[PDB]
Design a protein around this motif. Structure first.
Motif, PDB file in Angstrom:
ATOM      1  N   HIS A 159       0.821  -1.206   0.000  1.00 29.64           N
ATOM      2  CA  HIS A 159       0.000   0.000   0.000  1.00 29.64           C
ATOM      3  C   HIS A 159       0.856   1.257   0.000  1.00 29.64           C
ATOM      4  N   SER A 160       1.597   1.483   1.082  1.00 35.23           N
ATOM      5  CA  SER A 160       2.464   2.645   1.188  1.00 35.23           C
ATOM      6  C   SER A 160       3.916   2.247   1.391  1.00 35.23           C
ATOM      7  N   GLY A 161       4.241   0.968   1.240  1.00 37.13           N
ATOM      8  CA  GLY A 161       5.595   0.496   1.423  1.00 37.13           C
ATOM      9  C   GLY A 161       6.035   0.535   2.869  1.00 37.13           C
ATOM     10  N   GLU A 162       5.334  -0.191   3.727  1.00 41.32           N
ATOM     11  CA  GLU A 162       5.642  -0.201   5.145  1.00 41.32           C
ATOM     12  C   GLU A 162       6.664  -1.262   5.514  1.00 41.32           C
ATOM     13  N   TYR A 163       7.196  -1.978   4.531  1.00 39.15           N
ATOM     14  CA  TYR A 163       8.137  -3.050   4.805  1.00 39.15           C
ATOM     15  C   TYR A 163       9.103  -3.160   3.643  1.00 39.15           C
ATOM     16  N   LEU A 164      10.395  -3.194   3.947  1.00 44.02           N
ATOM     17  CA  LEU A 164      11.437  -3.305   2.938  1.00 44.02           C
ATOM     18  C   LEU A 164      12.127  -4.649   3.064  1.00 44.02           C
ATOM     19  N   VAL A 165      12.282  -5.343   1.941  1.00 41.71           N
ATOM     20  CA  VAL A 165      12.984  -6.616   1.922  1.00 41.71           C
ATOM     21  C   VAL A 165      14.339  -6.373   1.279  1.00 41.71           C
ATOM     22  N   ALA A 166      15.246  -7.344   1.398  1.00 38.83           N
ATOM     23  CA  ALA A 166      16.481  -7.400   0.628  1.00 38.83           C
ATOM     24  C   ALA A 166      17.043  -8.810   0.619  1.00 38.83           C
ATOM     25  N   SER A 167      17.926  -9.058  -0.337  1.00 38.36           N
ATOM     26  CA  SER A 167      18.633 -10.326  -0.458  1.00 38.36           C
ATOM     27  C   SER A 167      20.115 -10.015  -0.497  1.00 38.36           C
ATOM     28  N   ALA A 168      20.880 -10.612   0.404  1.00 36.56           N
ATOM     29  CA  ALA A 168      22.291 -10.279   0.462  1.00 36.56           C
ATOM     30  C   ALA A 168      23.063 -11.043  -0.615  1.00 36.56           C
ATOM     31  N   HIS A 169      24.346 -10.715  -0.763  1.00 34.77           N
ATOM     32  CA  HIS A 169      25.137 -11.187  -1.896  1.00 34.77           C
ATOM     33  C   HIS A 169      26.071 -12.330  -1.531  1.00 34.77           C
ATOM     34  N   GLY A 170      26.775 -12.212  -0.410  1.00 32.98           N
ATOM     35  CA  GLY A 170      27.816 -13.175  -0.097  1.00 32.98           C
ATOM     36  C   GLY A 170      27.248 -14.504   0.359  1.00 32.98           C
ATOM     37  N   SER A 171      28.083 -15.537   0.282  1.00 36.90           N
ATOM     38  CA  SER A 171      27.652 -16.856   0.710  1.00 36.90           C
ATOM     39  C   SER A 171      27.598 -16.917   2.232  1.00 36.90           C
ATOM     40  N   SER A 172      26.806 -17.879   2.722  1.00 41.50           N
ATOM     41  CA  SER A 172      26.238 -18.132   4.048  1.00 41.50           C
ATOM     42  C   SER A 172      25.140 -17.138   4.422  1.00 41.50           C
ATOM     43  N   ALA A 173      24.827 -16.159   3.574  1.00 36.15           N
ATOM     44  CA  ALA A 173      23.641 -15.328   3.745  1.00 36.15           C
ATOM     45  C   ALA A 173      22.519 -16.039   3.008  1.00 36.15           C
ATOM     46  N   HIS A 174      21.682 -16.742   3.761  1.00 39.53           N
ATOM     47  CA  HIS A 174      20.775 -17.740   3.216  1.00 39.53           C
ATOM     48  C   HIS A 174      19.319 -17.310   3.293  1.00 39.53           C
ATOM     49  N   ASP A 175      19.063 -16.014   3.411  1.00 43.91           N
ATOM     50  CA  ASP A 175      17.757 -15.599   3.894  1.00 43.91           C
ATOM     51  C   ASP A 175      17.452 -14.177   3.462  1.00 43.91           C
ATOM     52  N   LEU A 176      16.222 -13.959   3.017  1.00 44.85           N
ATOM     53  CA  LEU A 176      15.750 -12.607   2.770  1.00 44.85           C
ATOM     54  C   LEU A 176      15.539 -11.892   4.087  1.00 44.85           C
ATOM     55  N   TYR A 177      15.631 -10.570   4.062  1.00 39.55           N
ATOM     56  CA  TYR A 177      15.464  -9.807   5.289  1.00 39.55           C
ATOM     57  C   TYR A 177      14.163  -9.025   5.203  1.00 39.55           C
TER      58      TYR A 177
END
Lengths: 408, 382
Positions: free
Chosen positions: A271-289
């Motif tokens: 609706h108004s963008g109340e939540y920001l996601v991201a995906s990290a780049h390096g390995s062992s980062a296994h999860d969206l935030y």
């Protein structure tokens, strides 16, 4: 949408939490984009296919790239129309094919580019801004009354230099104005471009925030928030003031203090963008935030995967997160689960979570013409969406369905 | 198998020691209704598992019994044994009152009503729109936690409209007049004689033995209805210590079915009803008609004691349908979420007395309850 009218007691979330499907696509992918409804997932595949998936049974319905215009090299980005009728597909085979699912295997009009691409972004369903690599302007290609005259409109004024700013690598259109195009340079600076849809353009906004290669610029769908992903480790969400006349200000900065990873893709809420996601780049980062876009804290983590996740998409109807795990190639998918209810076995059960102390009443020892309308469709779902637009259903291939027992 | 229990330090009491012989149901603050403080009973035992509890005194004069019967209160009032745990009473008005979030309970008053014409009035102290009161009649068979009018072991009166209660039904057979904040209910309770009850006792004795009795062996259940004598008592009322103090494990009757004896003339099930019973209320002293001509004749064969079917049939052994000094209908009073009503005993507190000749209060029969219970157990001493 009537499943969400019956699923909860009335509480429905604003992000998915668990991950319930996984598209077993062994040839890897680059971009995943849903339809403007939750039905169809366009998958930008690595070798040059596009394996479009129906999001009800996890097995496809078509492949754009059979009759005419198949991508030889990789396909980079894709968008969809307002209704989901067309596809505008940017690739590394120096080709931007506008497809149409009326003829669900053949392209309509292509362009041999001077080199590879990064991304594509549509404003109307025909006109599409493309990012030609090593070019300090954005040759936005428009399908005109004739298809052949792809007017390579240079998204720059004739006097203005971005010498010292590099090339333009990102261009994302405004949601609410539909005519001012925000672009970001390869070195720091951010332009605005008011296309007149004649070809006069105004460099209303220019600035530099920090010296980096801007990988991505997104705008919130209410036109308020705009987030910038540099080539350094930060996410700068900004607030957008467009009445044209534009100026931004710093809202929040999101970093990973521990590992200092790069953020590949970022995406906002509905609706108004109340939540920001991201995906990290390096390995062992296994999860969206996730991040609460006002307070700034890491509020939730989509801990479902095993690999590094490259691209992302958030369709707001089905509330899914599609993301290609870049290492294996499989499309991870999150979905809001609904647990079952035995309360619908008989028309009066009740699922109370605690042993209630019901008070003892007296009764335990004792021994129409409303208004009826049949014509209108629904107007707003439980999510509160733009619903009452009956979408372009992609027709299944009724040219060769009889063949599909024998040999693909 | 067990011996009798000797006397303890509070049992043999000194002359100047004016301590009371069973320990008092001690008062503790429950709620504040009618601008009075009502009080509970804390450490006394209560009637559970189809049993009851009764105060005893350490009587020294007898050899076999070291304990015989006695009571707490000088006049009649609510018995403390049939009580809930969230039910409250007072020494000011003697009203029973459950809590503000508590449910439908009831308390009987200990008058043992067998024969004669007995009359007492019931004070209706308070009623609200959310509060209900069901004052009425119930047996020793019927328990306290259920509001009475659940079975044929008791009949009660509805709060508004006086719909007379029987097995959960609501019969509007009297004159309807609702209770208010200054009302009273007077139970003109005509029971026939004990000789009239004793010949109905042989009527269930003679028609359960061999008329319909052709299970696997029923002659030993015929024998208990053969030796089903109209007044004779097989009592097991023994004394026990409990929460450091002395009480009784007195036997209580178990729940049974409807007595339907087939009279050949009526060509249907015929019911056992007493000799012209009368169920009249005095709402402020006006005659309201007669509700129940059908009070049951009950004393040996209609209520079944706590009796053992498997331990006892192999063999000395007691009988199934016998009497005691506790059997009868009792002055009953129910409450609902704090509906405060009081029982009224003596004629000086009676405001609306009928001209009758046989007006008998509780305390005539309550004094007869004191004087018979000793001498019902002075035959036990031999």
């Amino acid at each position: 949408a009537n499943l969400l009218l019956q699923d909860p007691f009335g509480v429905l979330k604003e992000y998915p939490e668990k991950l319930t499907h996984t598209l077993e696509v062994p040839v890897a992918a680059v971009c995943v984009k849903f339809s403007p409804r939750g039905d169809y997932l366009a998958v930008g595949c690595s070798n040059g296919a596009i394996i479009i998936y129906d999001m009800d049974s996890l097995k496809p319905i078509a492949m754009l790239g059979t009759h005419s215009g198949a991508h030889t090299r990789s396909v980079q980005s894709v968008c969809w129309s307002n209704d989901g009728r067309y596809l505008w597909s940017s690739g590394r085979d120096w080709y931007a094919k506008l497809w149409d699912m009326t003829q669900p295997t053949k392209c309509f009009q292509q362009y041999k580019f001077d080199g590879p691409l990064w991304s594509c972004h549509v404003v109307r369903w025909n006109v599409c801004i493309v990012t030609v690599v090593e070019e300090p302007t954005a040759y936005v290609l428009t399908l005109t009354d004739r298809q052949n005259a792809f007017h390579c409109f240079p998204l720059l004024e004739q006097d203005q230099d971005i010498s010292g700013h590099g090339y333009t690598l990102v261009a994302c259109p405004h949601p609410t104005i539909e005519s001012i195009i925000i672009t970001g340079t390869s070195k720091g600076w951010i332009n605005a471009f008011q296309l007149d849809l004649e070809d006069k353009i105004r460099c209303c906004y220019e600035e530099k925030i920090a010296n980096a290669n801007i990988k991505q610029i997104i705008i919130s769908p209410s036109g308020t928030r705009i987030a910038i992903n540099g080539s350094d480790r930060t996410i700068r969400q900004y607030q957008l003031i467009v009445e044209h006349s534009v100026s931004i200000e710093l809202e929040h900065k999101y970093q990973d203090i521990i590992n200092r990873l790069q953020w590949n893709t970022i995406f906002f809420s509905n609706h108004s963008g109340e939540y920001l996601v991201a995906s990290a780049h390096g390995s062992s980062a296994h999860d969206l935030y996730l991040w609460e876009t006002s307070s700034g804290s890491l509020v939730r983590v989509l801990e479902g995967a095993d690999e590094e996740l490259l691209d992302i998409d958030w369709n707001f109807y089905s509330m899914r997160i599609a993301s290609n795990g870049f290492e294996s190639g499989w499309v991870y998918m999150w979905s809001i689960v609904i647990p079952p209810k035995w309360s619908a076995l008989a028309p009066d059960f009740e699922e109370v979570e605690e042993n209630i102390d019901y008070q003892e009443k007296e009764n335990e020892f004792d021994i129409e013409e409303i208004a009826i309308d049949l014509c209108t469709p629904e107007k707003y779902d439980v999510r509160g969406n733009d619903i009452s637009m009956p979408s372009f259903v992609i027709p299944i291939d009724y040219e060769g369905v009889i063949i599909q027992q024998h040999w693909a | 198998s067990v011996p009798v229990i000797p006397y303890l330090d509070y049992d043999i009491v000194d002359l100047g020691s004016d301590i009371k012989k069973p320990d008092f149901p001690q008062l503790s603050e429950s709620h504040r209704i009618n601008e009075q403080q009502y009080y509970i009973t804390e450490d006394t035992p209560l009637n559970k598992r189809n049993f009851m509890y009764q105060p005893c005194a350490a009587n020294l004069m007898l050899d076999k019994l070291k304990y015989c019967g006695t009571d707490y209160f000088d006049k009649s009032s609510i018995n403390l044994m049939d009580r809930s745990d969230k039910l409250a009473f007072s020494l000011d008005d003697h009203s029973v009152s459950v809590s503000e979030n508590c449910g439908w309970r009831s308390v009987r008053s200990d008058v043992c009503m067998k024969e004669g014409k007995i009359y007492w009035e019931v004070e209706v102290k308070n009623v609200s729109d959310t509060s209900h009161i069901r004052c009425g009649i119930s047996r020793r068979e019927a328990s306290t936690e259920t509001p009475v009018g659940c079975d044929f072991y008791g009949y009660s009166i509805r709060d508004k409209g006086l719909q007379v209660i029987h097995e959960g039904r609501l019969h509007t057979v009297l004159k309807p007049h609702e209770m208010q904040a200054g009302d009273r209910i007077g139970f003109l309770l005509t029971l026939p004689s004990l000789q009239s009850q004793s010949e109905q006792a042989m009527d269930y004795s003679l028609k359960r033995i061999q008329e319909l009795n052709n299970k696997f062996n029923k002659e030993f259940y015929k024998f208990l209805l053969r030796s089903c004598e109209p007044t004779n008592v097989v009592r097991d009322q023994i004394a026990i210590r409990y929460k450091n103090q002395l009480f009784y494990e007195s036997t209580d009757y178990v729940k049974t079915t409807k007595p339907e004896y087939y009279d050949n003339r009526d060509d249907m099930q015929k019911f056992y009803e007493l000799e012209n019973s009368s169920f009249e209320v005095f709402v402020n002293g006006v005659s309201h008609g007669i509700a129940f001509e059908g009070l049951t004749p009950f004393l040996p064969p209609f209520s079944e004691l706590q009796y053992n079917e498997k331990f006892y049939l192999h063999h000395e052994i007691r009988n199934k349908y016998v009497n005691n000094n506790r059997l009868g209908y009792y002055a009953t009073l129910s409450s609902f979420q704090g509906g405060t009503a009081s029982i009224i005993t003596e004629a000086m507190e009676l405001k609306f007395l009928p001209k009758d000749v046989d007006i008998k209060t509780l305390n005539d029969i309550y004094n007869e309850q004191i004087a018979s219970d000793i001498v019902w157990d002075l035959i036990d001493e031999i």
